[PDB]
Each structure stands twice: as C-alpha cells, then as structure tokens.
C-alpha cells in the first residue's frame, strides 16, 4: 500500500507492457513497472487486487507473464530481456506466487 511496498525486492529489465518496453520492479506489497524513457512507474498493482498470474512458456518469440485480477482485468508483461527473461518470468512468478496469496483472498 504505502509502507513496505516502497522497497523493491525484485528488479526486472527490458519488460514490455502494452507495446512499451521498460523495467519491472516488484515491491513488498505491490508490483510496479517503469516504462523506458520515463522517470515514474506507470504500473502499480497491489497483490491484493491480483487474483492469479499467467506465465507464457517457451515457443513464443518472447517470454511473458500476466497479472490476472479479480477485477476482470489482466496486466500482461512481455519479458523482452533475452538475457534473463525466462528466469525473470520465473522469479516474478515465484515472488508473486509467494506474495500474491499472502495479500489476496480467494473469491471462493
């Protein structure tokens, strides 16, 4: 919210969000992402609003992850960093699978 989620636990690079490349930064209580060329994060979602998460497997020209919210919305993250995109996808996934259920509550 606005206390511990101001610290970045996971730093991700070259991540495209909505046809725009940038850097992703996962915080204690929220997932944030800053677009390249900008000084501010245009992506700020609380793990409490995230229902689930998808990870796009190999076979695609890119590695991806997506924040599926219970709000009926989905935040897709295109990992364009060839260097660690796969592992990055995995770490974002891991940390979220770690973090998400600790802040959210099933709709059932």
């Amino acid at each position: 919210m606005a206390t511990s989620s101001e610290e970045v636990l996971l730093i991700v690079k070259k991540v495209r969000q909505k046809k725009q490349d940038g850097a992703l930064y996962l915080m204690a209580e929220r997932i944030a992402w800053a677009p390249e060329g900008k000084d501010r994060f245009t992506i700020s979602h609380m793990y409490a609003d995230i229902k689930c998460q998808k990870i796009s497997p190999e076979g695609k020209a890119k590695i991806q992850l997506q924040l599926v919210l219970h709000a009926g919305d989905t935040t897709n993250f295109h990992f364009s960093n060839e260097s660690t995109a796969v592992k990055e996808r995995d770490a974002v996934k891991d940390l979220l699978q770690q973090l998400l259920p600790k802040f959210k509550r099933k709709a059932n």
Partner: peptide
C-alpha cells in the same frame, strides 16, 4: 488482438489457479 495487443498472449499458462 482485441483487448490485449501486447503481441501474442494465448499459450499463457496459469499457476495461481481460480482464486
């Protein structure tokens, strides 16, 4: 595509399940 147009987002595998 319609709605999501980042590029290709279909083989997207879930993992958190139906929360």
């Amino acid at each position: 595509y319609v709605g999501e147009d980042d590029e290709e987002d279909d083989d997207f595998n879930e993992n958190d399940e139906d929360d």
